Short mmCIF file of C-alpha atoms and ligand atoms in Angstrom, two decimals:
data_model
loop_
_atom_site.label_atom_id
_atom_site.label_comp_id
_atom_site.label_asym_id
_atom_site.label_seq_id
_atom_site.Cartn_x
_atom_site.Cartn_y
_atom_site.Cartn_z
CA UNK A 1 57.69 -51.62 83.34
CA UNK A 2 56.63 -48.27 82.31
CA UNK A 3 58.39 -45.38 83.22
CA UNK A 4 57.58 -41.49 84.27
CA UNK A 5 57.07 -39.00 81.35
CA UNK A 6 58.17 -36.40 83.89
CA UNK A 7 60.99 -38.45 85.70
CA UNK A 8 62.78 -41.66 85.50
CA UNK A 9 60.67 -43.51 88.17
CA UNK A 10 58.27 -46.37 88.42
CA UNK A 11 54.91 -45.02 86.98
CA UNK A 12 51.66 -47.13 87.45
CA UNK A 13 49.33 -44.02 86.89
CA UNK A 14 48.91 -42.14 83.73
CA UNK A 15 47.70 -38.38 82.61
CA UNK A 16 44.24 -38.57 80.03
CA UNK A 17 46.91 -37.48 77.62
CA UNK A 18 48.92 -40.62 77.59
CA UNK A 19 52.14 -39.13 79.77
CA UNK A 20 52.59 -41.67 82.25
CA UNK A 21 53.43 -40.46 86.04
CA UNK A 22 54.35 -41.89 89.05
CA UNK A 23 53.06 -41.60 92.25
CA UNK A 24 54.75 -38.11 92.78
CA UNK A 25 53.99 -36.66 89.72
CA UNK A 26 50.17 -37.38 89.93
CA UNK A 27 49.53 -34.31 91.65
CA UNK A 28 51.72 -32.09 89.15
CA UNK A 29 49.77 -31.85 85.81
CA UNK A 30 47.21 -29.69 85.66
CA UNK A 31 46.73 -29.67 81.99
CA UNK A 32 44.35 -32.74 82.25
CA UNK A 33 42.87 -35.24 84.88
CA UNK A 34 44.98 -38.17 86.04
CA UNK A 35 42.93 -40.51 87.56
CA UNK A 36 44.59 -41.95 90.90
CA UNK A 37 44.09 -45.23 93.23
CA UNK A 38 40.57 -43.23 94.70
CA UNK A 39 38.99 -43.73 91.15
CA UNK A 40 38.62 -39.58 90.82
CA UNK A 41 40.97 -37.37 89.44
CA UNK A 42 44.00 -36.06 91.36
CA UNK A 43 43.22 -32.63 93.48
CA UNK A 44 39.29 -33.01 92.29
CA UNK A 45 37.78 -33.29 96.44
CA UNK A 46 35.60 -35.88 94.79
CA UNK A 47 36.59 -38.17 98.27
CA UNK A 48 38.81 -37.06 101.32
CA UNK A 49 41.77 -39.13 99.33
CA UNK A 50 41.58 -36.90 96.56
CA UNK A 51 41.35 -33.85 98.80
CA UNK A 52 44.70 -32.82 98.29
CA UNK A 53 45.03 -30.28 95.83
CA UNK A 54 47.23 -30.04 92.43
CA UNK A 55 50.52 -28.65 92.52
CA UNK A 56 52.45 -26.15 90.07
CA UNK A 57 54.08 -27.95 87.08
CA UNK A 58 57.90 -29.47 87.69
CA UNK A 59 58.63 -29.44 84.05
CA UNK A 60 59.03 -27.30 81.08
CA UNK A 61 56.42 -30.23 79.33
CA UNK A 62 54.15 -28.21 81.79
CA UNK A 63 54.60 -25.18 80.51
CA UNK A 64 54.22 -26.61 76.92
CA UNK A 65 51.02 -27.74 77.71
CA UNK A 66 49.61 -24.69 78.88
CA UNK A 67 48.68 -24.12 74.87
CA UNK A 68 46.97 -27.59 74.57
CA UNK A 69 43.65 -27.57 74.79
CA UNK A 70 42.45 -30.50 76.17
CA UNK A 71 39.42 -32.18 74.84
CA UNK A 72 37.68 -34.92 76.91
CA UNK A 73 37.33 -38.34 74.54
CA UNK A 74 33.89 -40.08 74.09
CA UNK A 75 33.08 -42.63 77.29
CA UNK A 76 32.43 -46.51 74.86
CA UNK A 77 31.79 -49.69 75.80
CA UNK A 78 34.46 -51.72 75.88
CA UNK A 79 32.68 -55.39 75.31
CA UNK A 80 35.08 -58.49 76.78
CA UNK A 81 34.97 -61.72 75.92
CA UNK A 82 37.97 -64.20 76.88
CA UNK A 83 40.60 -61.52 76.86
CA UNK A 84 39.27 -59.92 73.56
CA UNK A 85 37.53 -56.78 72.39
CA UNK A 86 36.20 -55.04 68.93
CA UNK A 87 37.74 -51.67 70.30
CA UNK A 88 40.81 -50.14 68.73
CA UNK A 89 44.03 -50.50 70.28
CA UNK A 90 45.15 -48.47 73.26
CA UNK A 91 45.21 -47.62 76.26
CA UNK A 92 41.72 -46.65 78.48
CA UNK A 93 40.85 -45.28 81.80
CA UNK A 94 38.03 -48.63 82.96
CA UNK A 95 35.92 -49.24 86.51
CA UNK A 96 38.72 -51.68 86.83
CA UNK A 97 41.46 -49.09 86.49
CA UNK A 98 43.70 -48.09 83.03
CA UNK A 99 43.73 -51.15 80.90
CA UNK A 100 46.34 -51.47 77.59
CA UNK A 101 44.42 -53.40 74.81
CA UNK A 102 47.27 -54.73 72.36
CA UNK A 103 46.41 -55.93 69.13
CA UNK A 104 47.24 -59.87 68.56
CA UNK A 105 46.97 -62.98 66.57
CA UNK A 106 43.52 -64.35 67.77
CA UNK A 107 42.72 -60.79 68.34
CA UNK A 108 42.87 -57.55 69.95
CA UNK A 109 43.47 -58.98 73.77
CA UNK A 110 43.24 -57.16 77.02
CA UNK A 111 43.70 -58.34 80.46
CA UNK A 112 40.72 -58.52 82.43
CA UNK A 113 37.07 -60.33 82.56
CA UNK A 114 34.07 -60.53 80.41
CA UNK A 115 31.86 -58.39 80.95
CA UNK A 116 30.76 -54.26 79.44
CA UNK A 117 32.72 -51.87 80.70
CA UNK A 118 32.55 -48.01 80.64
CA UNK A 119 35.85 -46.80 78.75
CA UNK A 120 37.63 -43.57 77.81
CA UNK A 121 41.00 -43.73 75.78
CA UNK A 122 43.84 -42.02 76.81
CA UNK A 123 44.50 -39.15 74.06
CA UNK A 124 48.13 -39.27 71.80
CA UNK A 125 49.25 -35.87 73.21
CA UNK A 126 51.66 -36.89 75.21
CA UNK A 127 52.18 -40.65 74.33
CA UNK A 128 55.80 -40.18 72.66
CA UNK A 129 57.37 -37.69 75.28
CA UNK A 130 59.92 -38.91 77.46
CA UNK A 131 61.62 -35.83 79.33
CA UNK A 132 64.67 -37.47 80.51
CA UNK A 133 65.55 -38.30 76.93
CA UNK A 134 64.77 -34.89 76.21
CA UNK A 135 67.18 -33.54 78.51
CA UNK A 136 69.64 -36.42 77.51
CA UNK A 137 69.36 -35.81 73.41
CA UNK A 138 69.32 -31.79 73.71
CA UNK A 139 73.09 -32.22 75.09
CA UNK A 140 73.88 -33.91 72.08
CA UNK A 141 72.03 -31.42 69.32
CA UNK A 142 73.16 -28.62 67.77
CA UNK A 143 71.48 -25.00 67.20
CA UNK A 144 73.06 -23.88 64.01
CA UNK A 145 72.38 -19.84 63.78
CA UNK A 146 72.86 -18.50 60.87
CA UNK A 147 74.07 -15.17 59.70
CA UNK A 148 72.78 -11.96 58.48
CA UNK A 149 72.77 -12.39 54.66
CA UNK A 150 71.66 -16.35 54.89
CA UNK A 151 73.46 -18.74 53.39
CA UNK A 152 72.06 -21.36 55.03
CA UNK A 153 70.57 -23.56 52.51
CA UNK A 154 74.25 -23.87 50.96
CA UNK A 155 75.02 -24.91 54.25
CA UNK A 156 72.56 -27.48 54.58
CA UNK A 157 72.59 -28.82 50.48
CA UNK A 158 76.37 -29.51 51.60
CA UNK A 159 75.38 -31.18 55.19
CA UNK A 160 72.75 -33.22 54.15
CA UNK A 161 72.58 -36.84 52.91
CA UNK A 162 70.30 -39.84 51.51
CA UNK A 163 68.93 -41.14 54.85
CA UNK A 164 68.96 -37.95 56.70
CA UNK A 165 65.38 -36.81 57.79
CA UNK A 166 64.56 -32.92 57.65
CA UNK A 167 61.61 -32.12 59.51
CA UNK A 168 59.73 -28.53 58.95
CA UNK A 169 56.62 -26.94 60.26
CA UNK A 170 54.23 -25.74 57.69
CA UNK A 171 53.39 -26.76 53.91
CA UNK A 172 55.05 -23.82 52.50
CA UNK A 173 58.19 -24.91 54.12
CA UNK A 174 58.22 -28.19 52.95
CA UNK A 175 57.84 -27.13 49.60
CA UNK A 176 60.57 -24.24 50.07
CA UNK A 177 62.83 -27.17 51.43
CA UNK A 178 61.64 -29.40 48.26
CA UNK A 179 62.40 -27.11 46.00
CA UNK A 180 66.13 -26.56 47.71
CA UNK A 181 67.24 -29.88 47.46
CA UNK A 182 66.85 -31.03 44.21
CA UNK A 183 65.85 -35.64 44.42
CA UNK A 184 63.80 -36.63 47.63
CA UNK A 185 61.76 -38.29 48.87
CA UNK A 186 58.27 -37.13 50.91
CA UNK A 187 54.52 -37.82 51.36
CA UNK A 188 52.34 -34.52 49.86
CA UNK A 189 50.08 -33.90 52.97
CA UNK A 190 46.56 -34.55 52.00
CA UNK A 191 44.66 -31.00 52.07
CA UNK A 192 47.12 -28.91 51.19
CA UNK A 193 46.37 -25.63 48.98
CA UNK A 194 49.91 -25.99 47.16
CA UNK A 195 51.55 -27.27 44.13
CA UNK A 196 53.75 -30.28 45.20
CA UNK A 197 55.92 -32.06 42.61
CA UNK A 198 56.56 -35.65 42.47
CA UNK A 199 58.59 -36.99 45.19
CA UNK A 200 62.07 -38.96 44.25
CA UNK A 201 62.77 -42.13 44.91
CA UNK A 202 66.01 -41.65 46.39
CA UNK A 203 67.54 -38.24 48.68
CA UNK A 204 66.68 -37.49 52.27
CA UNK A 205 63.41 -37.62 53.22
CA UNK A 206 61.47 -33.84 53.91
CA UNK A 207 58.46 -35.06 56.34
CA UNK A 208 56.04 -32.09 58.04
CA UNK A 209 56.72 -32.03 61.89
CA UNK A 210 53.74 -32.74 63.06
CA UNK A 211 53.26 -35.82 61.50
CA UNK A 212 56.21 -37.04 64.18
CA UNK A 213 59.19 -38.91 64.55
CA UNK A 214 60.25 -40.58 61.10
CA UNK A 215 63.25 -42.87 61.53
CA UNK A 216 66.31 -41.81 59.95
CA UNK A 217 69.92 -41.67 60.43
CA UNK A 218 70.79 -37.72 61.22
CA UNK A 219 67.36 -35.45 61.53
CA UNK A 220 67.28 -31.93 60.94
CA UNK A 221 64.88 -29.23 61.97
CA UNK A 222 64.21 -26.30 59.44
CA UNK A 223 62.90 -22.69 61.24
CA UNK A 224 63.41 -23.89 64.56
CA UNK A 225 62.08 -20.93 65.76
CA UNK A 226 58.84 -21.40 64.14
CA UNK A 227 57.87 -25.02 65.33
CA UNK A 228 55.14 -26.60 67.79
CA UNK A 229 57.14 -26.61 70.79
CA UNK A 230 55.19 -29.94 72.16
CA UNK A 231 56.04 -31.49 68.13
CA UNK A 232 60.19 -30.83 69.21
CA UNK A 233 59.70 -32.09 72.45
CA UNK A 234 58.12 -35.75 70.73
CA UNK A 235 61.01 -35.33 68.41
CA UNK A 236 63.65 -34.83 71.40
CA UNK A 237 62.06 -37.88 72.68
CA UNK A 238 63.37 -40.07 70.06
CA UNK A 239 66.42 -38.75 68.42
CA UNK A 240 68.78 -35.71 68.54
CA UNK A 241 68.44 -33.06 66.36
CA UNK A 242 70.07 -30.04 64.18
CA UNK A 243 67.98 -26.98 64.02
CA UNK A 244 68.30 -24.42 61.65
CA UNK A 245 67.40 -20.37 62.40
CA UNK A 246 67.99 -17.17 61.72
CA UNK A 247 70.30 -14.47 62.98
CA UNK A 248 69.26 -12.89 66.17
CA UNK A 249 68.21 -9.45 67.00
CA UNK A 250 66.73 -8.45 70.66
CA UNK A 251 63.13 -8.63 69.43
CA UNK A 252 60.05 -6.67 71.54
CA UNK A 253 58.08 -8.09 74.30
CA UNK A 254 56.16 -11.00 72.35
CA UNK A 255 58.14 -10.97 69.49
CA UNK A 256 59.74 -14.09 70.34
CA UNK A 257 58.29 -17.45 71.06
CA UNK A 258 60.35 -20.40 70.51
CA UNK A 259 60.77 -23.95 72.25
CA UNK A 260 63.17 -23.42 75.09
CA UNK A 261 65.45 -26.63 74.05
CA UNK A 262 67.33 -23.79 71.85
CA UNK A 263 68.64 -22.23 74.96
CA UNK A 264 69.94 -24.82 76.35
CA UNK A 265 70.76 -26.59 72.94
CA UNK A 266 74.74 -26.40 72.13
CA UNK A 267 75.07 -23.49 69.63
CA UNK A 268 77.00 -22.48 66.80
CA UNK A 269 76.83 -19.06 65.23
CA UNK A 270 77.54 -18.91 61.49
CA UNK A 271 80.34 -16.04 59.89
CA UNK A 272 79.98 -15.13 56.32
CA UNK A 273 83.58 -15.19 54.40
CA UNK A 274 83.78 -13.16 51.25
CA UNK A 275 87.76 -13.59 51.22
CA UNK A 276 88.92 -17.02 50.27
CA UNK A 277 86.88 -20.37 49.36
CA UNK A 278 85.43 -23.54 51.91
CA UNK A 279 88.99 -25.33 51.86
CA UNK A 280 91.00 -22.10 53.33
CA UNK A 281 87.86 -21.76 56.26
CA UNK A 282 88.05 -25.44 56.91
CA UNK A 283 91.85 -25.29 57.15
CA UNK A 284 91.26 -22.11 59.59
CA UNK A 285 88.45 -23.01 61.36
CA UNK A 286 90.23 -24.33 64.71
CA UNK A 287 91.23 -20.57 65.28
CA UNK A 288 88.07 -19.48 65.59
CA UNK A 289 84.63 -20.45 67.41
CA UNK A 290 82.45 -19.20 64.94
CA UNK A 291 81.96 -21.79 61.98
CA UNK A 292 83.47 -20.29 58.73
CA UNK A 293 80.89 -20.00 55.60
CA UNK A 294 82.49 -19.40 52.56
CA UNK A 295 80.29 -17.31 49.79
CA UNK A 296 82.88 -16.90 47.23
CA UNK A 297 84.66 -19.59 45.45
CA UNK A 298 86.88 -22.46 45.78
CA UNK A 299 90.94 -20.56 46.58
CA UNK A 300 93.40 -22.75 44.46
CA UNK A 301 96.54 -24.78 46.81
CA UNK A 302 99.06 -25.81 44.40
CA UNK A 303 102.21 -27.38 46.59
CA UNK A 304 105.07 -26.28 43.93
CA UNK A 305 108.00 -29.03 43.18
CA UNK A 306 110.51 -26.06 42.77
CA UNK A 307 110.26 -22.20 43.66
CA UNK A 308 108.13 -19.69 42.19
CA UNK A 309 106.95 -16.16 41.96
CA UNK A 310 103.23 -15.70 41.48
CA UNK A 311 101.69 -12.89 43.29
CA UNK A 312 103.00 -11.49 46.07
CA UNK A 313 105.95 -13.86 47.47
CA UNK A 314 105.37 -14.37 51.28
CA UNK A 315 108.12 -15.56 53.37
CA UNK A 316 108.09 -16.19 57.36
CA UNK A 317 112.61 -15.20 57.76
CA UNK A 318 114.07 -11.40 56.15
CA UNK A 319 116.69 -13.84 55.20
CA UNK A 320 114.76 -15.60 52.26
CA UNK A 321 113.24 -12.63 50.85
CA UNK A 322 114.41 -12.34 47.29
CA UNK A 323 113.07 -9.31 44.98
CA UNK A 324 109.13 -7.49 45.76
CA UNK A 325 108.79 -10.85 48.43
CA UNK A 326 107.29 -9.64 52.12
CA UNK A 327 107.37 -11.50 54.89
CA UNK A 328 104.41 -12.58 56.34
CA UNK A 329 104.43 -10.56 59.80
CA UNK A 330 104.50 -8.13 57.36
CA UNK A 331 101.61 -8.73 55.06
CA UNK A 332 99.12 -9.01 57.79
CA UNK A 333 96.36 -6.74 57.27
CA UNK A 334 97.13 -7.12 53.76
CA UNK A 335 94.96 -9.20 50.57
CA UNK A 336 95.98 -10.42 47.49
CA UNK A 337 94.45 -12.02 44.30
CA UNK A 338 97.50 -14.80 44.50
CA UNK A 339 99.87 -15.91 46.98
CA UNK A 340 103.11 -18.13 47.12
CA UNK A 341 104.04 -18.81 50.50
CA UNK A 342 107.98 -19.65 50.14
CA UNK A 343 109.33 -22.12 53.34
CA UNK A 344 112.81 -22.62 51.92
CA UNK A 345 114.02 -22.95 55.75
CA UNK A 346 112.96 -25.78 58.24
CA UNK A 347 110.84 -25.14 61.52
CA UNK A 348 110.23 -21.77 60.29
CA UNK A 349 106.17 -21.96 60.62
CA UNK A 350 104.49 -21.46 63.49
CA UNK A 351 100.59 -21.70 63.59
CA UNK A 352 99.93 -17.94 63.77
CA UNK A 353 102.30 -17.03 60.41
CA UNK A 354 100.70 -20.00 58.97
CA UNK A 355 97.40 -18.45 59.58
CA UNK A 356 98.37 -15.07 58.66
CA UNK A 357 100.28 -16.47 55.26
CA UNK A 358 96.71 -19.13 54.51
CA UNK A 359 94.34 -16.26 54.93
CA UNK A 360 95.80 -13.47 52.39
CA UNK A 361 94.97 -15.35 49.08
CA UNK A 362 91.58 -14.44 47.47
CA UNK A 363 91.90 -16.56 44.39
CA UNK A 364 95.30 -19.07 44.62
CA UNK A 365 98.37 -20.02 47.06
CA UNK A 366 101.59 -21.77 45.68
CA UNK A 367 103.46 -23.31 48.62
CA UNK A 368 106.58 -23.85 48.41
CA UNK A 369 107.79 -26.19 51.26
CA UNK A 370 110.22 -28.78 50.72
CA UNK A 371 110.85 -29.39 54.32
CA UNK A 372 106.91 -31.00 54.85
CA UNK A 373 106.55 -28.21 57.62
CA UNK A 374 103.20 -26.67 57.24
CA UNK A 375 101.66 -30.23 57.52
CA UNK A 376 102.91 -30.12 60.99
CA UNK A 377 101.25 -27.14 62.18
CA UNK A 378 97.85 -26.71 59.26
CA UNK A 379 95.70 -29.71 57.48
CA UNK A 380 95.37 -27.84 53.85
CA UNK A 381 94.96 -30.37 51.12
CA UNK A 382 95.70 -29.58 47.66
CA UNK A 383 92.79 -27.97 45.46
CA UNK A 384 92.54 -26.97 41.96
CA UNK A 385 90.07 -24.88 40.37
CA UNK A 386 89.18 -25.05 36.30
CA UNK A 387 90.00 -21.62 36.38
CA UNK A 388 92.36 -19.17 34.16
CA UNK A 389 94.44 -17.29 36.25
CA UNK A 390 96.09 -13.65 36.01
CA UNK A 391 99.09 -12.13 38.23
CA UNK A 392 101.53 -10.12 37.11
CA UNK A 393 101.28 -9.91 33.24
CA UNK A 394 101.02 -13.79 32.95
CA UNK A 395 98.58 -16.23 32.90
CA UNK A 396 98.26 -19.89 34.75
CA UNK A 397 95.96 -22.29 33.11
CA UNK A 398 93.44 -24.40 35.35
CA UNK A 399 96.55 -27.43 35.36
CA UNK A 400 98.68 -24.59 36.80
CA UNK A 401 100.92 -23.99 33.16
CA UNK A 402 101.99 -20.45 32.35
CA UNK A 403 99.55 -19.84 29.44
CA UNK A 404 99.64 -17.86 26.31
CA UNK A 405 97.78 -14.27 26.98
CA UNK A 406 94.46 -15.00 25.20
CA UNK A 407 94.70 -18.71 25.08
CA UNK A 408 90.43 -19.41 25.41
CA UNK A 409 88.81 -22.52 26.81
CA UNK A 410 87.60 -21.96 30.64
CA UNK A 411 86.63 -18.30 32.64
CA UNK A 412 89.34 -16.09 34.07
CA UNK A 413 89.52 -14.84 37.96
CA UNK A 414 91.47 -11.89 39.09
CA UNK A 415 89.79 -8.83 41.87
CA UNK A 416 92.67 -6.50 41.82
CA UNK A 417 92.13 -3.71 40.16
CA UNK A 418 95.34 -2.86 38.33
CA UNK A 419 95.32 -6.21 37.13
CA UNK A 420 92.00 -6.67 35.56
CA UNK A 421 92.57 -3.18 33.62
CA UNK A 422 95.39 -4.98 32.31
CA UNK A 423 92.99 -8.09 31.06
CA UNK A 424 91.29 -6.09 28.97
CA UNK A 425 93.42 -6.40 26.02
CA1 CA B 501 46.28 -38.44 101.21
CA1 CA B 502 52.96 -20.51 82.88
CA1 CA B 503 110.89 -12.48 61.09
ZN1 ZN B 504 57.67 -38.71 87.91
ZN1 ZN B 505 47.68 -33.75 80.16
ZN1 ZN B 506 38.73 -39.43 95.20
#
């Protein structure tokens, strides 16, 4: 019950690769010799059976395999004596046609007479691939670009976890990637011209790609664009995967080589956010198909028992504006350091003021809403920050309390200018 590498079907013949083919398929891999039901290779006019001559490759794996070189293996003896031989276990091309030999308890046995028989293994090339799980597991990976300025390793410190698996292609990247993430866990590759450290005992494991598919809960793929095309495709085999590249740019003719699985691979562009913290772009992110990466720091939400007036006082109804307050069709276009979005009125929040209202703050937002109603319409938790702030001038501590002007313990935020001219006394 072995199936096609190529297809799903029935596959009683095999490439000297190890990618087992059905009948079909025989007659489509040029890369190496697939020995058929004649006893000579497929297209090779060895006998009138084998006449026929090779088709061009009906798979990307073809393609692939064009950079391959395929080396013939030594022909051994494989010795046979009551279903057992010294030989290593495998698979080999015989007189008697391609034999598995599977190690045992008694020893390593193999199913057919005694006798000496002429042998060649089948090579590991091809012995994890499996396109149709290719093509099933690229549906369900993502291609996570990232942007111009990268950010990308505080995206991935934050994504990553203990049993996750992060594959990468050279040494140097392993030990970039080892050096990111602080505890893990790894093998140092034996030959290597670098300066590992000691691997952790506990963190997600950082394992070179072409040592193959490690198993793990959620695997990653660092420079996707850099890897051995055939290595993704035996990891695509096994799992699904999130790979991590660059920004692009339309690159010259040959500038670009990378394992066509990224084209069709579900993608996700990343945006830089200087503006407001993580916890404002998560609470935004459904408006917008880019995924929001916050460089600056955490913005404040305090949800205020009473109402207040710290920085500028936004307000969705002319009705409820009260002193310097704006209302928030107003304000867009607009930034502050500090916000305090006032909803003394019920079902006055739509999404879009909501939006406008959450994205203005650079530093904090006091919400006033008694009536429960942004819930309804934005998922924005509640955040401090040990932080001291300034608005005008007063102060508000990191347990939001109006603090004494110089009262010292944590640092002090505050990008308008007026206002930190002001701080300097
Ligand atoms: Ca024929
Ligand atoms: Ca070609
Ligand atoms: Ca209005
Ligand atoms: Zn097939
Ligand atoms: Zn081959
Ligand atoms: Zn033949």
């Amino acid at each position: 019950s072995r199936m096609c590498g190529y297809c799903g079907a029935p596959a009683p013949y095999a490439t000297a690769c190890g990618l087992d083919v059905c009948v079909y398929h025989t007659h489509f891999h040029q890369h190496c010799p697939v020995i058929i039901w004649c006893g000579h290779p497929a297209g090779s006019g060895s006998c009138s059976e084998c006449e026929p001559p090779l088709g061009k490759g009906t798979s990307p794996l073809d393609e692939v395999l064009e950079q391959v070189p395929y080396k013939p293996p030594r022909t051994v003896i494989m010795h046979v004596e009551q279903g057992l031989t010294p030989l290593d276990p495998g698979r080999y091309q015989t007189r008697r046609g391609l034999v598995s030999v599977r190690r045992g308890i008694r020893g390593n046995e193999v199913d057919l007479p005694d006798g000496d028989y002429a042998s060649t293994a089948l090579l590991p090339t091809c012995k994890e691939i499996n396109m149709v799980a290719v093509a099933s597991n690229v549906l369900r990976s993502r291609f996570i670009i990232g942007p111009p300025g990268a950010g990308k390793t505080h995206w991935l410190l934050q994504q990553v976890q203990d049993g996750d698996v992060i594959y990468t292609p050279t040494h140097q990247t392993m030990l970039d990637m080892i050096r990111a993430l602080g505890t893990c866990r790894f093998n140092v590759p034996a030959g290597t011209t670098l300066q590992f450290p000691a691997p952790s005992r506990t963190g997600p494991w950082v394992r070179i790609l072409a040592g193959g598919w490690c198993p793990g809960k959620n695997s990653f793929l660092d420079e996707a664009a850099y890897c051995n095309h055939l290595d993704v495709l035996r990891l695509l085999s096994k799992t699904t995967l999130t790979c991590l590249g660059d920004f692009k740019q339309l690159h010259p003719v040959g500038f670009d080589s990378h394992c066509y699985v990224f084209d069709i691979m579900p993608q996700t562009q990343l945006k830089t956010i200087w503006r407001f913290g993580q916890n404002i772009c998560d609470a935004i992110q459904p408006d917008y198909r880019d995924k929001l990466m916050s460089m600056v720091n955490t913005t404040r939400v305090t949800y205020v028992e009473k109402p207040v007036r710290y920085g500028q006082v936004l307000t969705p109804y002319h009705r409820d504006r009260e002193d310097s307050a704006i209302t928030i069709d107003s304000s867009q276009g607009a930034t502050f350091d500090v916000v305090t979005l006032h909803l003394p009125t019920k079902d006055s929040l739509n999404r879009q003021r909501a939006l406008v209202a959450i994205t203005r703050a650079r530093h904090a937002i006091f919400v006033y809403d008694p009536h429960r109603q942004l819930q309804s319409v934005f998922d924005l938790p509640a955040k401090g920050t040990p932080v001291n702030l300034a608005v005008h001038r007063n102060n508000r501590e990191i347990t939001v309390a109006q603090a004494l002007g110089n009262g010292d313990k944590f640092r002090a935020t505050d990008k308008r200018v007026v206002d930190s001219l002001r701080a300097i006394c």
